Design a protein around this ligand. Structure first.
Ligand SMILES: [Cu+2]
Ligand SMILES: [Cu+2]
Ligand SMILES: [Cu+2]
Ligand SMILES: [Cu+2]
Ligand SMILES: [Cu+2]
Ligand SMILES: [Cu+2]
Ligand SMILES: [Mg+2]
Ligand SMILES: [Mg+2]
Ligand SMILES: [Mg+2]
Ligand SMILES: [Mg+2]
Ligand SMILES: [Mg+2]
Ligand SMILES: [Mg+2]
Ligand SMILES: [Mg+2]
Ligand SMILES: [Mg+2]
Ligand SMILES: [Mg+2]
Lengths: 328, 328, 328
């Protein structure tokens, strides 16, 4: 088969691809370097992170159903921990987890057949308590396996997006001093026991998009134009989420994220199960600011799960109009 | 278009309406007054509440798909906070949030087109941390946008309800003294910091139907007759719920709440995503008491999420019979 | 109608049955003894348990749609509490709860018609705060009501399983000393107040399959062969779960668990609503170890929600291959 080498792009963006496969099956070649580093989650909150390719989430991979995926995974010598990868897209050996365990200083190449269309989580899963710990330290991303003929709606009609944004949502469990301020450590291992204690409460200290509070707001805000069909691919490798586009809807939504299932329509809020990726298509109809949020609003605002979308275009009074301005 | 002025009715009831639109599109006129007040949630538990029209949830609005909605929203001078409204039913300006911010002493009129059929949350969302806070202080309701030709099942057959009940479920975060008793404040602002601390744990002190523990039990119990088709419209603006009619089922269920999607059938328990409204139709077959509950039973019983339904009619031994009474 | 007496088998196994009903409607006779006993959840963690037939979950019952179910329920004199049973499969009297309350020393026989196909929770529900308490002390199981003609897919095609495994997931709330170690009591009543306090946080101390941490790992691991179609019936009577077969998928999934609804396909992770049972069919394609987990990985690993499946057969390099072994 033809081989195709991809240059991955950081989230929320996506590497160059075509929705309708331009060729028959190919072998898709990707490479990622595991990067262990402390990352700033919020003003005075840091995580001893473990990442695929330096980002949280790991970068989005896009292939077509029936293609193969060959991932070269590298664990540089500066790292402290063994690591591996579990593709929920894959069949066998714990999603690849059982064939990809690498020590600092090693690399591995895994091939699998992308036999099933949909957005899928990939995540580290070295074994035992290392499994949740590596995930909640940021070690998860997404691979999107498109049907060879592109997306289809609930009636089998072809549908197309102008833009895909990959929204990786991640729950983190940063230990706190008695006064509520966050603790700092020299490395992930030093912080492990105190993190486990937070993990055991099941209460995230932070729940973020693109690896930090406000990553996708301000200068990081998503951009679109009236008329654009935007696919929002949303992963959550460990905990549930309930995405909502404030001022919009999900025109077509695969909340369980598998493209041969019929999508639901007109959703206000949908549901990403912890350990999965879903996808929602919306055509923007109005200009202005939108917020894309986890609609546990405490999770959205206090914990960090809020992105903004800035949309340019012409306002439509038929859809909405302020008939009487605030007055009194 | 014709204009129609509605008199809203408190939950769990619904204002006068027809399921199959009697006319072509109309402009529906509603008015609500924001009422800030301390409300009793339980025997020794009070909330500094912020309400639409004095109730938790805010009252149910019912219109048809393609109609317009013109809401006059009033923030009386006795109130302390600015407020607004986000209709998840609406397209643009943060659901109307960006066009409806009003100070105490002001009123505003918003128009929007109800372009999408389904039950939708409406909720206050003034901006930033005010957003979760106003919601968890009780500031949310529901608008139900019926298809012009009424409800249809999974096969496109017309279906009809005898009764709609609006069940508004709300999670609250009342601060506690060390001994577990609940704190009281002079106004919402005074209580804000202590409430944020509870909010951050993500653990509600109370989860209630119709604004208080036992609101829909005892004298508040819902009523029906064997043979009645009852639509249970269930909102939860901030947190997930898993509704269950004890002794019954969901005959037709739109758990994501959007009527053009095919409903599921025969459900024991369904799922309302935080930030959404769903709807379930059941035809009562047996008389007696039923409980309608969030089936996290701790949430149902300890937190307050239990309603009762008292059903009159004739018992059917073919469905169930006590063959041998307790004996020994 | 013919009467059929069943010998129940402990979970995760299932009593002898046929998927396509061999006869027209029958009356299915089951008997269960309530057993109150302290059970070991983990190395140094015990629960004052209340069980159907001595197991957590209670044993799986399997009947066909249109059959009757006659359960003889026995509360031996050594027990301390009244008990009853609520079949979510049943119509009327709080699922049978209102016809089955029995004191220690009593027995009762309930008949109901299994009018609806699907997997359903059954659980104790004596009344008031006894309801969540008996459930979280282990008092819940499942009845699976198969369509008379067996399972059908999203296109109405007959499908068949080789093996059903009943995975009962249960959240428990064991009180802790200040140092984080677990408390022991002489009986359930002695432990009640301290358990309520844990219940109120909504944070389980343990979340287990088949009644204990590691029940379904090690010697308890599930077994299958490449090619086997295994139905995983998954109940959670009180709290949500998000099941995942590591290294596999859900080929056909009824996450809300009602068989006349079309299943979704190719799922990575699905969702069991608290208070329900769902079911997922998978055909094993690769040999080796799999883990079946709640994909809140903290819940899976720290809390106990992990089962293993050991699969024998021939490896398929087309699906997955380690192209370059760890090297460096
Ligand atoms: Cu790792
Ligand atoms: Cu996984
Ligand atoms: Cu407000
Ligand atoms: Cu909203
Ligand atoms: Cu009991
Ligand atoms: Cu129940
Ligand atoms: Mg690179
Ligand atoms: Mg400090
Ligand atoms: Mg469209
Ligand atoms: Mg009025
Ligand atoms: Mg006090
Ligand atoms: Mg019917
Ligand atoms: Mg026996
Ligand atoms: Mg101790
Ligand atoms: Mg198949």
């Amino acid at each position: 088969l033809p081989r195709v080498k991809h240059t991955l792009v950081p989230p929320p963006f996506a590497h160059a691809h075509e929705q309708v496969a331009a060729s028959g099956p190919v072998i898709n070649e990707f490479e990622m370097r595991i990067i262990e580093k402390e990352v700033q989650l919020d003003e005075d909150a840091y995580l001893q992170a473990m990442t695929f390719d330096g980002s949280i989430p790991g970068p989005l991979m896009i292939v077509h159903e029936g293609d193969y995926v060959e991932l070269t995974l590298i664990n540089p010598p500066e790292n402290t921990m063994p690591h591996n990868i579990d593709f929920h897209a894959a069949t066998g050996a714990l999603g690849g987890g059982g064939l990809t365990l690498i020590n600092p200083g090693e690399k591995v190449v895994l091939r699998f057949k992308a036999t099933r269309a949909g957005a899928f989580v990939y995540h580290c899963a070295p074994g035992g308590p290392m499994i949740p710990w590596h995930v909640v330290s940021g070690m998860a991303g997404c691979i999107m396996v498109l049907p060879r003929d592109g997306l289809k709606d609930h009636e089998g009609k072809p549908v197309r997006y102008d833009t895909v944004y990959y929204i990786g949502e991640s729950d983190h469990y940063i230990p706190k001093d008695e006064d509520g301020t966050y603790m700092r450590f020299s490395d992930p291992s030093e912080g492990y026991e105190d993190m486990v204690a937070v993990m055991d409460t099941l209460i995230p200290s932070h729940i973020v998009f693109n690896g930090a509070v406000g990553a996708l707001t301000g200068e990081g805000a998503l951009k679109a134009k009236v008329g654009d069909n935007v696919l929002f691919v949303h992963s959550q490798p460990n905990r549930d989420s309930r995405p909502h586009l404030i001022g919009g809807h999900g025109d077509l939504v695969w909340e369980t994220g598998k493209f041969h299932n019929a999508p639901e329509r007109d959703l206000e809020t949908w549901f990403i199960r912890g350990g999965s990726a879903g996808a929602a298509l919306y055509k923007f109809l109005q200009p202005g600011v939108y917020a894309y949020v986890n609609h546990n609003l405490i999770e959205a605002v206090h914990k960090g799960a809020t992105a903004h979308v800035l949309v340019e275009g012409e306002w439509d009074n038929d859809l909405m109009e302020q008939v009487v301005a605030p007055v009194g």
